[PDB]
Write a protein that binds this DNA or RNA. Structure first.
Lengths: 82, 63, 100, 206, 145, 141, 143
RNA sequence: UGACGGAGCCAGCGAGUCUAACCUUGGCCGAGAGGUCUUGGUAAUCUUGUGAAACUCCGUCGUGCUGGGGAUAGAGCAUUGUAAUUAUUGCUCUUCAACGAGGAAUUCCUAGUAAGCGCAAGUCAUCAGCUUGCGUUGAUUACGUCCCUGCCCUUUGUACACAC
RNA sequence: UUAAUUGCGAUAACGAACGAGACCUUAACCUACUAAAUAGUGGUGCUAGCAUUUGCUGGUUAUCCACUUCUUAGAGGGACUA
């Protein structure tokens, strides 16, 4: 029959599932320049998958730089703490 | 965007084929004492400053 | 002896004066008692189609009926169950004497 | 300050909230003025609120909807798209989360950013049906200040809602990006582009 | 911070029980590709194998995949409930079995053929192509031919 | 005979009674402190009557509120209305009008719902639709 | 002061009591902890794996403290939820009776909940004192 | 503005056994359905505070016809009945298909209303995706018109009277 | 003019009847009456936990006392657009 609708997503650029080294130096030197950082920000600009930002967002919050302005349900808002 | 701030002083009545527009007698705050009639789509009662992008077009009942 | 007068009916006015007569017989002599307890009315509701056949716009009905229940609590020896037992019964309302 | 501690203690932050009026606990309602004199008396920012969740009697008559806080109107208009009907506890959660991003990025008062955005995305001219008798035909008319605010809020909500459809970005940042971009009058805004379409259509059919 | 690096042991694709097991996903869900293993059974297999559930399929040491594989082919020996198997009380012998990637489809054809050869209602309707559980077909099941 | 007052409050179908007696400043709901609401967003909505006028008038009273009925927001609206009416009741059996009248003016100056209950109630459902106004989908051909 | 189980938030107390149940696992560990689905409505077993039994015990004991008498069916109704019956709409489904039974009996073995008259269970006298001592701890941990 | 797993977790309408076997509390057994021994109730009293769901907070996940979605089937375990086979229904595992917002056209709606959410009752030995009611969360949009679809009164015209 | 031949008024018409309206039920208000362990509330005893310093959170029908704000009602009031 006829659908009158499109069927396509785009081009899935699948990326890091386990944190590597060549981008471990990247994250430690690139997110401290984010005035606004959250789960989605480094998903787009830093190109990070699902279960690595949450660890990385927990990484720096416990260790250093970025600070909990508002971490809450389904939204972890952090700033460029300096 | 050259606009003209105009405040209404009297509402004539709702017009149009479906009653979606209203005739209002409106005067401009700047360069006052000059009064024109204009159309309004949204709800207007009185003392409402509508942003008139063009201030030179005489309004009339619409079909 | 814990005589309790239970009254159920569908007519509020007829049940009211029966309680009034019972309570007026109670406040005479001595008969320290408890007044009328106002139980919530039990409202039956059977919803039925008005149409006897199947043809017609969907128009439902609701045949309701209200039951008013009030109980009268007495406390006295046999010298009033020769006296209270004289039922002041009107059509409709009923009485059930319950002791203890 | 007033350090009064009762039998049941309250955190000092809540005690601080009694100094000024409600304030959304972090965001000044004052020093926020609607730039356009047209939308004055219709964008309610003078009356403050702890939360944007009130059971107001706004729809009974014509103009009590104007006497409603602008922030609360945003939460109401964010409650759309079918399945997201009700759940006002959620709607204020994005509003609180989105309102925070307006503070972390573009560091001014987010309430000020909200009011200037709606005054910059409210259509000033619009077209209307006048087909009368003969297939179709448009004709341009004007927009009341109340309709300008209503259209402005609707465009911002639908734009962020559509841009959050099947996308990793949550509605919180999508609302924040849409409001910020519309605040500074950039072309990437869905609401700004829609305002251009309606004004151009009305201008052509003038 | 619970951050660890990778040395190169990650393999983007796996092959267990003669089927393709794609990596880049958690082990509990990457095993669902096997024909005959679902979310619950894969969770049960991973739980008894002690394979650190929060682990990607690629980032799995080879000594744990064989332990998982052996549980797949003999679940009842590793303290798995008898009620956690797809093929219970087999018509041939009666021992509680568990069909696998190639066994799930093949065994399915045998029981239909057994049903067909005995000329039962389910067997003949299966050959016909209609419903065999008693659904209505007057307005449903149209775009099938 | 220790000083005490009582009030009530409703939102849609809930009830909340505040036995505001003379105490050291304890505000509890169902045995829990006022700081433990449940929506965690309308916590400042129930914090309202605490903060419109100040905490100094709250230092000699203890408001104990028991709530039953309604949704979580309805319970919250019951609590805020009960404590607001509880505050005026304590000022309506002991303290002077200047304390009470500007208390009872300022509460309504911000919102009338603090003392006046919401008059709207659910409407009965009519046959032919899932709700009162709503109707089933009718069609021709 | 006068702090108690009602002077604490739910999430902090249950986690705190779960914390003061994992460090020494005195209560019990059933043999079928890793295979239950907690109900016929839930589609998946709990993802806590290692724990989730003292977490339920913490929630049950806290629920017992604020009440007087409950039952296993009462716990099943409370801990149940909506079930996605395929294309059919959702429906309320009770929890797994065996799970609440094992938790309730486990709380009896330690001495935190015992049987009560008029049927049902009730918080224990040793149970009340330790549960209240938990509240005095979790508040001061944040302090 | 999601799904899943934990916690918090609040309603209203209403029904319920006598010479029958109903609503079932509680304890025990079973992953579950369910079974078992008992208890309370002819009812504001006992089922039931119907501890309902949508809802909120912690986590798992990730923009992936994928942890979305559960049609289609295979095997097993129980309930109802004299009888279930073209599976009554319930429970467990496994198979994981169309569907990525829907074309001409069209339905309902002005406040607790729409919509989202579940519950009770009716049919009932068993079987709700139905209906009748109840409550929970709760928007935007008008305060007008006869343009479209129809109605009332008057004037007017008629070769209509089973009457455009 | 009204939701309404519902009214003002006009008037070879006058006086009327049915419908509508009026009426009934329900949802809202009553800190005013009658009350009430088959609904509750507060208090006095018994008793538990935390801190003990002054309190808070509870359990308890034969421990009793007082009340009807919330819970139900019956008789009534209130709304007429002032």
């Amino acid at each position: 029959k006829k659908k009158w609708s499109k069927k396509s997503m785009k081009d899935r650029a699948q990326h890091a599932v386990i944190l590597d080294q060549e981008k471990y130096d990247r994250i430690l030197k690139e997110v401290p320049t984010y005035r606004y950082v959250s789960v989605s920000v480094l998903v787009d600009r830093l190109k990070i998958g699902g279960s690595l930002a949450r660890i990385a967002l927990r990484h720096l919050e416990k260790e250093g730089i970025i600070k909990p302005i508002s971490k809450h349900s389904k939204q972890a808002i952090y700033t460029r703490a300096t | 965007t050259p606009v003209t701030l105009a405040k209404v002083i009297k509402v004539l009545g709702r017009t149009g084929s479906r009653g979606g527009v209203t005739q209002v007698r409106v005067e401009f705050l700047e360069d006052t004492s000059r009064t024109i009639v204009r159309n309004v789509k949204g709800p207007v009662r009185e003392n409402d400053i509508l942003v008139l992008m063009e201030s030179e077009r005489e309004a009339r009942r619409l079909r | 002896i814990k005589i309790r007068i239970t009254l159920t009916s569908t007519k509020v006015k007829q049940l009211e004066n029966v309680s009034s007569n019972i309570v007026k017989n109670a406040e005479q002599h001595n008969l320290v008692k408890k007044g009328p307890v106002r139980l919530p009315t039990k409202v039956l509701k059977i919803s039925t189609r008005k149409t006897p056949n199947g043809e017609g716009s969907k128009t439902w009905e609701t045949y309701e009926m209200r039951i008013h229940k009030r109980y009268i609590d007495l406390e006295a020896p046999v010298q009033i169950v020769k006296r209270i037992t004289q039922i002041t019964i009107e059509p409709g309302v009923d009485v059930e004497v319950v002791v203890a | 300050f007033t350090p009064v501690v009762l039998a049941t203690p309250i955190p000092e932050e809540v005690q601080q909230a009694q100094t000024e009026i409600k304030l959304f606990n972090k965001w000044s309602f004052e020093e926020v003025e609607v730039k356009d004199a047209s939308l004055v008396d219709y964008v309610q920012v003078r009356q403050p609120i702890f939360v944007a969740h009130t059971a107001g009697r706004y729809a009974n008559k014509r103009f009590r909807k104007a006497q409603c806080p602008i922030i609360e109107r945003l939460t109401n208009s964010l409650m759309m798209n079918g399945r997201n009907n009700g759940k006002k506890l959620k709607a204020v959660r994005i509003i609180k989360h989105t309102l925070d991003i307006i503070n972390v990025l573009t560091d001014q008062n987010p309430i000020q950013v909200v009011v200037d955005a709606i005054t910059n995305t409210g259509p000033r001219e619009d077209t209307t049906r006048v087909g009368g008798g003969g297939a179709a035909r448009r004709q341009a008319v004007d927009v009341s200040p109340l309709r300008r605010v209503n259209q402005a809020i609707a465009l911002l909500t639908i734009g962020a809602r559509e841009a959050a459809f099947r996308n990793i970005k949550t509605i919180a940042e999508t609302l924040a990006e849409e409001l910020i971009n519309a605040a500074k009058g950039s072309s990437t805004s869905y609401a700004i582009k829609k305002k251009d379409e309606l004004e151009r259509v009305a201008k052509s059919n003038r | 911070s619970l951050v660890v690096q990778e040395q190169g042991s990650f393999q983007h694709i796996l092959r267990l029980l003669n089927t393709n097991v794609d990596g880049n996903i958690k082990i509990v869900y990457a095993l669902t590709t096997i024909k005959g293993v679902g979310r619950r059974y894969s969770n049960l297999v991973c739980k008894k194998a002690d394979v650190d559930l929060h682990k990607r399929a690629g980032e799995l040491t080879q000594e744990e995949l064989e332990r998982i594989v052996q549980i797949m082919q003999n679940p009842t020996h590793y303290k798995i409930p008898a009620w956690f198997l797809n093929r219970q009380n087999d018509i041939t012998d009666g021992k509680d079995y568990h069909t696998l990637a190639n066994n799930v489809e093949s065994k399915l054809r045998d029981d239909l053929e057994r049903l067909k050869k005995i000329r039962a209602h389910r067997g003949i309707r299966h050959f016909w192509g209609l419903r065999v559980r008693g659904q209505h077909t007057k307005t449903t099941g149209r775009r099938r031919a | 005979a220790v000083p005490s007052v009582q009030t009530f409050g409703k939102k849609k179908s809930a009830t909340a009674v505040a036995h505001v007696k003379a105490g050291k400043g304890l505000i509890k709901v169902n045995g829990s402190p006022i700081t433990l609401v449940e929506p965690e967003i309308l916590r400042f909505k129930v914090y309202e009557p605490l903060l419109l006028v100040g905490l100094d008038k709250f230092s000699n009273i203890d408001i104990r509120v028991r709530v039953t009925g309604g949704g979580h927001v309805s319970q919250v609206y019951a609590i805020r209305q009960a404590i607001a009416k509880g505050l005026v009741a304590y000022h309506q059996k002991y303290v002077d009008e200047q304390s009470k009248n500007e208390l009872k003016k300022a509460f309504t100056s911000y919102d009338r719902t603090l003392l006046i209950a919401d008059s709207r109630r659910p409407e009965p459902k009519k046959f032919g639709g899932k709700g009162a106004r709503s109707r089933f989908q009718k069609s021709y051909r | 002061p006068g702090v108690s189980v009602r002077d604490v938030a739910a999430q902090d107390f249950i986690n705190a009591y779960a914390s003061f149940l994992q460090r020494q696992g005195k209560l019990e560990v059933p043999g079928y902890v890793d295979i239950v689905k907690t109900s016929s409505g839930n589609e998946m077993p709990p993802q806590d794996a290692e724990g989730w039994f003292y977490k339920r015990a913490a929630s049950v004991a806290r629920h017992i403290y604020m009440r007087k008498q409950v039952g296993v069916g009462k716990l099943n109704k409370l801990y149940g939820g909506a079930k996605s019956r395929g294309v059919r709409p959702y429906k309320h489904i009770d929890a797994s009776g065996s799970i609440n039974r094992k938790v309730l009996q486990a709380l009896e073995k330690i001495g935190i909940v015992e049987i009560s008259p008029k049927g049902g269970r009730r918080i224990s006298e040793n149970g009340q004192r330790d549960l209240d001592r938990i509240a005095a701890q979790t508040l001061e941990e944040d302090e």
